[PDB]
Amino acid sequence: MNPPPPETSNPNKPKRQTNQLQYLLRVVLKTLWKHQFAWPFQQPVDAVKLNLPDYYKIIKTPMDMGTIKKRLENNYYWNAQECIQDFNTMFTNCYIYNKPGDDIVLMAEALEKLFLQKINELPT
Ligand SMILES: O=[N+]([O-])c1cc(Cl)c(O)c2ncccc12
């Protein structure tokens, strides 16, 4: 079945809140969340429901915007770069599992371009 979801808290990890990390939540994630193509990325891939029994055979560092949102809400990250790496893992996993031009990939590519637009300029 499905693996445990990625952690959204960790008391051994030091927490921080920066202007940039608040912006990644309130502006970047909250607007990506509203996109019509966001729904596949709002929660961990349910390989059992989706009948993708090889998914977690191939994807060993899963990530999703639901997990990122909870991390941001928990101040789980030390800096904005940690959060941006999670977004990139999410996108890269989708391009690894799937193939150019697949419906799910076109959705990921639309979100990625939007994501790149929004982090082009972060607050001070
Ligand atoms: O939720 N989904 O339907 C979903 C999400 C993600 Cl992130 C994927 O890579 C998928 N790949 C193939 C089929 C469905 C997928």
Side-chain angles (χ1 to χ4, degrees), residues 2-124:
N2 298 314
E7 69 180 15
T8 53
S9 58
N10 183 339
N12 301 321
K13 195 181 187 300
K15 296 174 153 201
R16 207 163 61 146
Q17 186 44 287
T18 61
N19 287 2
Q20 316 205 50
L21 272 164
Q22 311 175 294
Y23 183 83
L24 277 165
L25 179 52
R26 302 202 241 272
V27 172
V28 184
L29 192 139
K30 303 265 173 85
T31 70
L32 277 173
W33 199 267
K34 314 255 178 112
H35 198 275
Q36 63 160 353
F37 289 167
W39 66 260
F41 312 102
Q42 293 172 334
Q43 59 287 306
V45 165
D46 186 342
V48 176
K49 173 180 62 169
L50 285 159
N51 288 119
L52 312 169
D54 54 2
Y55 185 84
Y56 290 109
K57 305 300 128 81
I58 297 159
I59 303 303
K60 301 316 211 176
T61 303
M63 191 46 64
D64 66 275
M65 277 199 301
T67 299
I68 299 170
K69 179 168 190 273
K70 295 209 251 302
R71 289 183 170 190
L72 285 163
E73 286 167 345
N74 292 356
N75 298 322
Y76 169 93
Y77 297 112
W78 188 254
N79 57 38
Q81 200 35 67
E82 290 190 341
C83 175
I84 291 168
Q85 286 160 218
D86 276 352
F87 273 102
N88 281 318
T89 301
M90 179 183 77
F91 290 128
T92 288
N93 289 344
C94 184
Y95 309 140
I96 291 168
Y97 184 71
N98 298 287
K99 302 189 191 140
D102 284 349
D103 268 8
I104 181 80
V105 164
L106 295 165
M107 297 168 89
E109 284 173 346
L111 293 214
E112 188 188 7
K113 278 172 252 137
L114 174 57
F115 169 78
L116 284 169
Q117 269 162 219
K118 297 256 132 186
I119 67 167
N120 225 294
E121 199 183 17
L122 302 170
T124 293

